[PDB]
Write an enzyme that holds these catalytic residues in place. Structure first.
Site, PDB file in Angstrom:
ATOM      1  N   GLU A   1     -46.007  82.096 -42.183  1.00  8.70           N
ATOM      2  CA  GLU A   1     -44.649  82.020 -41.667  1.00  8.70           C
ATOM      3  C   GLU A   1     -43.651  82.888 -42.402  1.00  8.70           C
ATOM      4  O   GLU A   1     -42.668  83.332 -41.816  1.00  8.70           O
ATOM      5  CB  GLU A   1     -44.188  80.578 -41.639  1.00  8.70           C
ATOM      6  CG  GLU A   1     -45.021  79.784 -40.667  1.00  8.70           C
ATOM      7  CD  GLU A   1     -44.992  78.308 -40.931  1.00  8.70           C
ATOM      8  OE1 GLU A   1     -44.131  77.820 -41.692  1.00  8.70           O
ATOM      9  OE2 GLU A   1     -45.850  77.625 -40.338  1.00  8.70           O
TER      10      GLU A   1
ATOM     11  N   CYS B   1     -41.847  75.452 -38.308  1.00 14.65           N
ATOM     12  CA  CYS B   1     -42.859  74.510 -38.838  1.00 14.65           C
ATOM     13  C   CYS B   1     -42.183  73.262 -39.352  1.00 14.65           C
ATOM     14  O   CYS B   1     -41.601  72.519 -38.567  1.00 14.65           O
ATOM     15  CB  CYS B   1     -43.921  75.163 -39.751  1.00 14.65           C
ATOM     16  SG  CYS B   1     -45.177  74.233 -40.393  1.00 14.65           S
TER      17      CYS B   1
ATOM     18  N   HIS C   1     -43.194  71.632 -36.305  1.00 13.28           N
ATOM     19  CA  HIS C   1     -44.588  71.236 -36.344  1.00 13.28           C
ATOM     20  C   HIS C   1     -44.756  69.799 -35.873  1.00 13.28           C
ATOM     21  O   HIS C   1     -43.891  68.962 -36.120  1.00 13.28           O
ATOM     22  CB  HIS C   1     -45.141  71.371 -37.749  1.00 13.28           C
ATOM     23  CG  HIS C   1     -46.633  71.401 -37.795  1.00 13.28           C
ATOM     24  ND1 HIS C   1     -47.397  70.282 -38.054  1.00 13.28           N
ATOM     25  CD2 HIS C   1     -47.505  72.404 -37.545  1.00 13.28           C
ATOM     26  CE1 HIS C   1     -48.677  70.609 -38.018  1.00 13.28           C
ATOM     27  NE2 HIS C   1     -48.768  71.890 -37.709  1.00 13.28           N
TER      28      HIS C   1
END
EC number: 4.2.1.130
Lengths: 190, 190
Positions: A15, A110, A129
Protein backbone atom coordinates in the site's frame (compact mmCIF):
# COMPACT_ATOMS: atom_id res chain seq x y z
CA UNK A 1 0.98 19.67 -6.70
CA UNK A 2 2.96 17.91 -3.96
CA UNK A 3 2.06 14.66 -2.19
CA UNK A 4 2.80 13.44 1.34
CA UNK A 5 2.77 9.68 1.78
CA UNK A 6 2.65 9.03 5.56
CA UNK A 7 4.52 5.99 6.83
CA UNK A 8 4.98 4.41 10.25
CA UNK A 9 6.52 1.30 11.65
CA UNK A 10 4.12 -1.44 10.49
CA UNK A 11 2.95 0.33 7.31
CA UNK A 12 2.07 -2.15 4.59
CA UNK A 13 4.69 -2.41 1.80
CA UNK A 14 2.17 -2.94 -1.00
CA UNK A 15 0.00 0.00 0.00
CA UNK A 16 2.97 2.29 0.34
CA UNK A 17 4.54 1.25 -2.96
CA UNK A 18 1.52 1.65 -5.21
CA UNK A 19 0.84 5.36 -4.71
CA UNK A 20 4.57 6.01 -4.43
CA UNK A 21 5.27 4.43 -7.82
CA UNK A 22 2.24 5.99 -9.47
CA UNK A 23 3.05 9.56 -8.43
CA UNK A 24 6.72 9.08 -9.30
CA UNK A 25 5.74 7.95 -12.80
CA UNK A 26 3.51 11.03 -13.01
CA UNK A 27 6.52 13.23 -12.13
CA UNK A 28 4.53 14.74 -9.29
CA UNK A 29 6.67 15.42 -6.21
CA UNK A 30 5.97 13.00 -3.38
CA UNK A 31 7.68 12.75 0.02
CA UNK A 32 7.49 9.90 2.52
CA UNK A 33 6.81 11.35 5.96
CA UNK A 34 7.59 9.12 8.90
CA UNK A 35 5.58 9.09 12.11
CA UNK A 36 7.90 7.47 14.66
CA UNK A 37 11.06 8.06 16.63
CA UNK A 38 14.00 6.50 14.81
CA UNK A 39 16.38 9.42 14.38
CA UNK A 40 17.59 8.21 11.00
CA UNK A 41 14.04 7.91 9.60
CA UNK A 42 14.51 4.16 9.22
CA UNK A 43 11.15 2.36 9.14
CA UNK A 44 10.27 -1.28 9.72
CA UNK A 45 7.35 -2.01 7.42
CA UNK A 46 4.45 -4.38 8.20
CA UNK A 47 6.08 -7.38 6.51
CA UNK A 48 9.62 -6.53 7.70
CA UNK A 49 11.07 -4.41 4.87
CA UNK A 50 13.46 -1.85 6.31
CA UNK A 51 13.34 1.38 4.34
CA UNK A 52 14.17 5.04 4.81
CA UNK A 53 11.59 7.81 4.84
CA UNK A 54 12.36 11.23 3.36
CA UNK A 55 11.19 13.29 6.33
CA UNK A 56 10.00 13.03 9.93
CA UNK A 57 6.60 14.50 10.80
CA UNK A 58 8.45 16.40 13.54
CA UNK A 59 9.82 18.71 10.84
CA UNK A 60 6.37 20.16 10.22
CA UNK A 61 5.10 22.40 13.05
CA UNK A 62 1.33 22.25 12.42
CA UNK A 63 -1.44 21.18 10.06
CA UNK A 64 -1.63 24.74 8.72
CA UNK A 65 2.06 24.51 7.82
CA UNK A 66 1.53 21.03 6.36
CA UNK A 67 -1.20 22.50 4.14
CA UNK A 68 1.25 25.02 2.69
CA UNK A 69 3.63 22.19 1.77
CA UNK A 70 1.37 19.43 0.51
CA UNK A 71 -1.83 19.09 -1.49
CA UNK A 72 -2.48 15.37 -1.03
CA UNK A 73 -2.14 13.40 2.23
CA UNK A 74 -2.04 9.59 1.95
CA UNK A 75 -2.57 7.26 4.92
CA UNK A 76 -1.60 3.68 3.99
CA UNK A 77 -2.63 0.59 5.97
CA UNK A 78 -1.02 -2.45 7.49
CA UNK A 79 -2.52 -3.34 10.84
CA UNK A 80 0.13 -1.81 13.09
CA UNK A 81 1.05 1.13 10.87
CA UNK A 82 -2.58 2.22 10.62
CA UNK A 83 -3.04 1.98 14.41
CA UNK A 84 -0.12 4.38 14.85
CA UNK A 85 -1.15 6.82 12.12
CA UNK A 86 -4.82 6.87 13.17
CA UNK A 87 -3.91 7.69 16.78
CA UNK A 88 -1.34 10.42 16.06
CA UNK A 89 -2.79 13.85 16.81
CA UNK A 90 -0.76 15.49 14.01
CA UNK A 91 -2.22 13.13 11.39
CA UNK A 92 -5.74 13.69 12.72
CA UNK A 93 -5.13 17.44 12.52
CA UNK A 94 -3.95 17.21 8.91
CA UNK A 95 -7.01 15.10 8.03
CA UNK A 96 -9.41 17.58 9.67
CA UNK A 97 -7.64 20.49 7.93
CA UNK A 98 -7.69 18.91 4.47
CA UNK A 99 -11.29 17.61 4.60
CA UNK A 100 -13.52 19.53 2.14
CA UNK A 101 -10.72 21.89 0.93
CA UNK A 102 -11.04 22.62 -2.81
CA UNK A 103 -7.37 22.19 -3.67
CA UNK A 104 -6.56 19.28 -1.33
CA UNK A 105 -7.20 15.52 -1.28
CA UNK A 106 -6.93 12.75 1.37
CA UNK A 107 -6.44 9.05 0.63
CA UNK A 108 -6.80 6.23 3.18
CA UNK A 109 -6.43 2.50 2.41
CA UNK A 110 -6.99 -0.85 4.25
CA UNK A 111 -6.95 -0.10 7.98
CA UNK A 112 -5.96 3.50 7.16
CA UNK A 113 -9.64 4.54 7.05
CA UNK A 114 -9.79 4.15 10.86
CA UNK A 115 -8.25 7.66 10.72
CA UNK A 116 -11.56 9.02 9.43
CA UNK A 117 -13.19 7.71 12.61
CA UNK A 118 -10.46 9.07 14.89
CA UNK A 119 -10.47 12.46 13.14
CA UNK A 120 -14.25 12.78 13.56
CA UNK A 121 -14.93 13.12 9.81
CA UNK A 122 -18.64 13.39 8.96
CA UNK A 123 -18.52 11.69 5.54
CA UNK A 124 -21.47 9.34 5.01
CA UNK A 125 -19.88 6.49 3.04
CA UNK A 126 -16.53 4.74 3.42
CA UNK A 127 -14.64 1.56 2.69
CA UNK A 128 -11.63 -0.21 4.14
CA UNK A 129 -10.38 -3.70 4.83
CA UNK A 130 -13.06 -6.16 5.88
CA UNK A 131 -11.13 -6.65 9.16
CA UNK A 132 -11.93 -3.04 10.23
CA UNK A 133 -15.51 -2.98 8.89
CA UNK A 134 -17.05 -3.53 12.33
CA UNK A 135 -14.96 -0.75 13.82
CA UNK A 136 -16.01 1.68 11.06
CA UNK A 137 -19.70 0.80 11.43
CA UNK A 138 -19.52 1.32 15.20
CA UNK A 139 -18.44 4.91 14.51
CA UNK A 140 -21.54 5.39 12.37
CA UNK A 141 -20.18 5.04 8.83
CA UNK A 142 -21.89 3.32 5.90
CA UNK A 143 -19.40 0.68 4.70
CA UNK A 144 -19.42 0.01 0.94
CA UNK A 145 -17.99 -3.25 -0.42
CA UNK A 146 -16.10 -1.97 -3.48
CA UNK A 147 -12.43 -1.31 -4.28
CA UNK A 148 -12.46 2.51 -4.03
CA UNK A 149 -14.86 5.05 -2.50
CA UNK A 150 -14.87 8.82 -2.91
CA UNK A 151 -16.74 11.16 -0.58
CA UNK A 152 -16.01 14.89 -0.75
CA UNK A 153 -12.21 14.94 -1.16
CA UNK A 154 -11.70 11.71 0.82
CA UNK A 155 -10.73 8.63 -1.19
CA UNK A 156 -10.80 5.30 0.68
CA UNK A 157 -9.90 1.78 -0.47
CA UNK A 158 -9.98 -1.82 0.74
CA UNK A 159 -6.72 -3.70 0.72
CA UNK A 160 -3.38 -4.47 -0.84
CA UNK A 161 -5.30 -5.84 -3.85
CA UNK A 162 -6.81 -2.37 -4.47
CA UNK A 163 -3.70 -0.25 -3.82
CA UNK A 164 -3.09 0.37 -7.51
CA UNK A 165 -6.71 1.42 -8.13
CA UNK A 166 -6.47 3.64 -5.02
CA UNK A 167 -3.27 5.32 -6.22
CA UNK A 168 -4.82 5.91 -9.63
CA UNK A 169 -7.93 7.47 -8.13
CA UNK A 170 -5.74 9.97 -6.27
CA UNK A 171 -3.72 10.74 -9.40
CA UNK A 172 -6.98 11.24 -11.33
CA UNK A 173 -7.86 14.24 -9.18
CA UNK A 174 -4.68 16.18 -10.02
CA UNK A 175 -3.22 14.94 -13.33
CA UNK A 176 -4.17 16.27 -16.73
CA UNK A 177 -6.19 13.91 -18.93
CA UNK A 178 -3.12 13.07 -21.01
CA UNK A 179 -0.82 12.60 -18.01
CA UNK A 180 -3.34 10.30 -16.35
CA UNK A 181 -3.84 8.24 -19.53
CA UNK A 182 -0.08 7.91 -20.08
CA UNK A 183 0.64 6.83 -16.53
CA UNK A 184 -2.31 4.42 -16.61
CA UNK A 185 -1.16 2.84 -19.88
CA UNK A 186 2.37 2.38 -18.50
CA UNK A 187 1.15 0.21 -15.62
CA UNK A 188 -0.31 -2.67 -17.66
CA UNK A 189 -3.45 -2.71 -15.56
CA UNK A 190 -5.21 -6.08 -15.89
CA UNK B 1 9.43 -23.78 0.75
CA UNK B 2 11.96 -20.95 0.69
CA UNK B 3 11.80 -17.99 -1.67
CA UNK B 4 14.50 -15.68 -3.01
CA UNK B 5 13.34 -12.28 -4.21
CA UNK B 6 16.26 -10.83 -6.13
CA UNK B 7 16.72 -7.06 -5.92
CA UNK B 8 19.15 -4.61 -7.49
CA UNK B 9 19.63 -0.89 -7.67
CA UNK B 10 16.80 0.20 -9.96
CA UNK B 11 14.37 -2.56 -8.95
CA UNK B 12 10.74 -1.49 -9.13
CA UNK B 13 9.11 -0.90 -5.73
CA UNK B 14 5.65 -2.15 -6.72
CA UNK B 15 6.95 -5.37 -8.28
CA UNK B 16 9.19 -6.09 -5.31
CA UNK B 17 6.47 -5.39 -2.74
CA UNK B 18 3.66 -7.53 -4.18
CA UNK B 19 5.37 -10.97 -4.11
CA UNK B 20 7.09 -9.95 -0.88
CA UNK B 21 3.85 -9.16 0.92
CA UNK B 22 2.06 -12.19 -0.51
CA UNK B 23 4.69 -14.74 0.58
CA UNK B 24 4.92 -13.06 3.98
CA UNK B 25 1.13 -13.37 4.45
CA UNK B 26 1.45 -17.03 3.45
CA UNK B 27 4.07 -17.54 6.18
CA UNK B 28 6.50 -18.84 3.59
CA UNK B 29 10.12 -17.81 4.23
CA UNK B 30 11.37 -15.18 1.81
CA UNK B 31 14.74 -13.37 1.63
CA UNK B 32 15.57 -10.31 -0.41
CA UNK B 33 18.90 -10.97 -2.13
CA UNK B 34 20.77 -7.96 -3.46
CA UNK B 35 22.86 -7.95 -6.62
CA UNK B 36 25.00 -4.81 -6.74
CA UNK B 37 27.96 -2.78 -5.50
CA UNK B 38 26.69 -1.42 -2.19
CA UNK B 39 28.52 -3.15 0.66
CA UNK B 40 25.81 -2.28 3.23
CA UNK B 41 22.98 -3.92 1.23
CA UNK B 42 21.38 -0.50 0.81
CA UNK B 43 19.41 -0.52 -2.42
CA UNK B 44 18.29 2.54 -4.37
CA UNK B 45 15.06 1.35 -5.98
CA UNK B 46 13.70 2.41 -9.37
CA UNK B 47 11.57 5.24 -8.05
CA UNK B 48 14.05 6.29 -5.36
CA UNK B 49 13.00 4.31 -2.29
CA UNK B 50 16.09 3.37 -0.27
CA UNK B 51 15.64 -0.07 1.33
CA UNK B 52 17.92 -2.68 2.94
CA UNK B 53 18.09 -6.11 1.42
CA UNK B 54 18.37 -9.11 3.78
CA UNK B 55 21.36 -10.59 1.95
CA UNK B 56 23.92 -9.97 -0.72
CA UNK B 57 24.18 -12.62 -3.43
CA UNK B 58 27.89 -12.63 -2.69
CA UNK B 59 27.07 -14.61 0.48
CA UNK B 60 26.03 -17.57 -1.65
CA UNK B 61 29.04 -19.36 -3.06
CA UNK B 62 27.52 -20.94 -6.20
CA UNK B 63 24.29 -21.61 -8.07
CA UNK B 64 24.28 -25.19 -6.76
CA UNK B 65 24.51 -23.71 -3.24
CA UNK B 66 21.63 -21.38 -4.06
CA UNK B 67 19.56 -24.42 -5.12
CA UNK B 68 20.30 -25.97 -1.70
CA UNK B 69 18.81 -22.88 -0.02
CA UNK B 70 15.88 -21.73 -2.17
CA UNK B 71 13.03 -23.28 -4.13
CA UNK B 72 11.65 -20.17 -5.85
CA UNK B 73 13.63 -17.43 -7.57
CA UNK B 74 11.87 -14.14 -8.37
CA UNK B 75 13.19 -11.49 -10.73
CA UNK B 76 11.30 -8.19 -10.45
CA UNK B 77 11.39 -5.36 -13.00
CA UNK B 78 12.31 -1.72 -13.21
CA UNK B 79 14.53 -0.81 -16.16
CA UNK B 80 17.85 -0.57 -14.38
CA UNK B 81 17.16 -3.38 -11.94
CA UNK B 82 16.16 -5.80 -14.68
CA UNK B 83 19.18 -4.76 -16.78
CA UNK B 84 21.44 -5.65 -13.86
CA UNK B 85 19.74 -8.87 -12.85
CA UNK B 86 19.38 -10.17 -16.42
CA UNK B 87 23.09 -9.63 -17.02
CA UNK B 88 24.40 -11.24 -13.84
CA UNK B 89 25.69 -14.78 -14.49
CA UNK B 90 24.72 -15.93 -10.98
CA UNK B 91 21.11 -15.03 -11.67
CA UNK B 92 21.19 -16.65 -15.14
CA UNK B 93 22.76 -19.80 -13.64
CA UNK B 94 20.02 -20.06 -11.04
CA UNK B 95 17.31 -19.61 -13.66
CA UNK B 96 18.88 -22.24 -15.93
CA UNK B 97 19.25 -24.71 -13.07
CA UNK B 98 15.68 -24.20 -11.83
CA UNK B 99 13.95 -24.43 -15.23
CA UNK B 100 11.83 -27.60 -15.60
CA UNK B 101 13.04 -28.96 -12.24
CA UNK B 102 10.46 -30.53 -10.00
CA UNK B 103 9.45 -28.35 -7.04
CA UNK B 104 11.41 -25.34 -8.18
CA UNK B 105 9.75 -22.21 -9.60
CA UNK B 106 10.89 -19.05 -11.37
CA UNK B 107 9.03 -15.75 -11.64
CA UNK B 108 9.99 -12.75 -13.80
CA UNK B 109 7.95 -9.54 -14.16
CA UNK B 110 7.99 -6.37 -16.38
CA UNK B 111 11.54 -6.12 -17.74
CA UNK B 112 12.55 -9.11 -15.57
CA UNK B 113 11.68 -11.56 -18.39
CA UNK B 114 14.72 -10.33 -20.32
CA UNK B 115 16.47 -12.86 -18.06
CA UNK B 116 14.85 -15.72 -19.99
CA UNK B 117 16.70 -14.70 -23.17
CA UNK B 118 20.05 -13.99 -21.48
CA UNK B 119 19.86 -17.37 -19.68
CA UNK B 120 18.92 -19.23 -22.88
CA UNK B 121 15.64 -20.66 -21.54
CA UNK B 122 13.84 -22.77 -24.15
CA UNK B 123 10.28 -21.81 -23.18
CA UNK B 124 8.05 -21.13 -26.19
CA UNK B 125 5.86 -18.35 -24.80
CA UNK B 126 6.44 -15.34 -22.55
CA UNK B 127 5.04 -12.06 -21.39
CA UNK B 128 6.56 -8.87 -20.02
CA UNK B 129 6.20 -5.12 -20.18
CA UNK B 130 4.92 -3.86 -23.56
CA UNK B 131 8.06 -1.68 -23.62
CA UNK B 132 10.22 -4.80 -23.91
CA UNK B 133 7.91 -6.82 -26.13
CA UNK B 134 10.22 -6.45 -29.15
CA UNK B 135 13.32 -7.44 -27.16
CA UNK B 136 11.50 -10.51 -25.83
CA UNK B 137 10.24 -11.61 -29.25
CA UNK B 138 13.80 -11.06 -30.51
CA UNK B 139 14.81 -14.06 -28.40
CA UNK B 140 12.39 -16.24 -30.38
CA UNK B 141 9.65 -16.20 -27.74
CA UNK B 142 5.98 -15.84 -28.60
CA UNK B 143 4.67 -12.85 -26.65
CA UNK B 144 1.24 -13.21 -25.02
CA UNK B 145 -0.68 -10.03 -24.20
CA UNK B 146 -2.17 -11.11 -20.88
CA UNK B 147 -1.33 -10.33 -17.27
CA UNK B 148 0.39 -13.64 -16.39
CA UNK B 149 1.85 -16.55 -18.34
CA UNK B 150 2.79 -19.93 -16.88
CA UNK B 151 4.89 -22.34 -18.93
CA UNK B 152 6.54 -25.35 -17.28
CA UNK B 153 7.69 -23.78 -13.96
CA UNK B 154 8.29 -20.27 -15.32
CA UNK B 155 5.82 -17.53 -14.44
CA UNK B 156 6.12 -14.24 -16.33
CA UNK B 157 4.01 -11.10 -15.98
CA UNK B 158 3.50 -7.66 -17.56
CA UNK B 159 3.88 -4.69 -15.24
CA UNK B 160 3.34 -2.98 -11.94
CA UNK B 161 -0.43 -3.35 -12.48
CA UNK B 162 -0.03 -7.13 -12.63
CA UNK B 163 2.38 -7.56 -9.71
CA UNK B 164 -0.31 -8.84 -7.34
CA UNK B 165 -1.60 -11.37 -9.93
CA UNK B 166 2.03 -12.37 -10.49
CA UNK B 167 2.75 -12.98 -6.80
CA UNK B 168 -0.49 -14.89 -6.50
CA UNK B 169 0.35 -17.13 -9.45
CA UNK B 170 3.66 -18.01 -7.81
CA UNK B 171 1.93 -18.72 -4.49
CA UNK B 172 -0.68 -20.87 -6.24
CA UNK B 173 1.99 -23.31 -7.38
CA UNK B 174 3.29 -24.07 -3.88
CA UNK B 175 0.51 -23.47 -1.35
CA UNK B 176 -2.37 -25.81 -0.70
CA UNK B 177 -5.69 -24.73 -2.19
CA UNK B 178 -6.81 -23.98 1.37
CA UNK B 179 -3.88 -21.70 2.18
CA UNK B 180 -3.98 -20.04 -1.24
CA UNK B 181 -7.68 -19.25 -0.83
CA UNK B 182 -7.14 -17.74 2.64
CA UNK B 183 -4.27 -15.53 1.48
CA UNK B 184 -6.24 -14.52 -1.61
CA UNK B 185 -9.29 -13.58 0.44
CA UNK B 186 -7.18 -11.41 2.77
CA UNK B 187 -5.94 -9.22 -0.12
CA UNK B 188 -9.30 -7.76 -1.14
CA UNK B 189 -8.57 -8.47 -4.80
CA UNK B 190 -10.89 -6.41 -7.03
Amino acid sequence: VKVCLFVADGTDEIEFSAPWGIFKRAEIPIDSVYVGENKDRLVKMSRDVEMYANRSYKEIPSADDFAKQYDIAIIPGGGLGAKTLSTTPFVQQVVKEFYKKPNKWIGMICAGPLTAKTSGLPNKQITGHPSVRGQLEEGGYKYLDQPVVLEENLITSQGPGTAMLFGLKLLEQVASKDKYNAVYKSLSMP
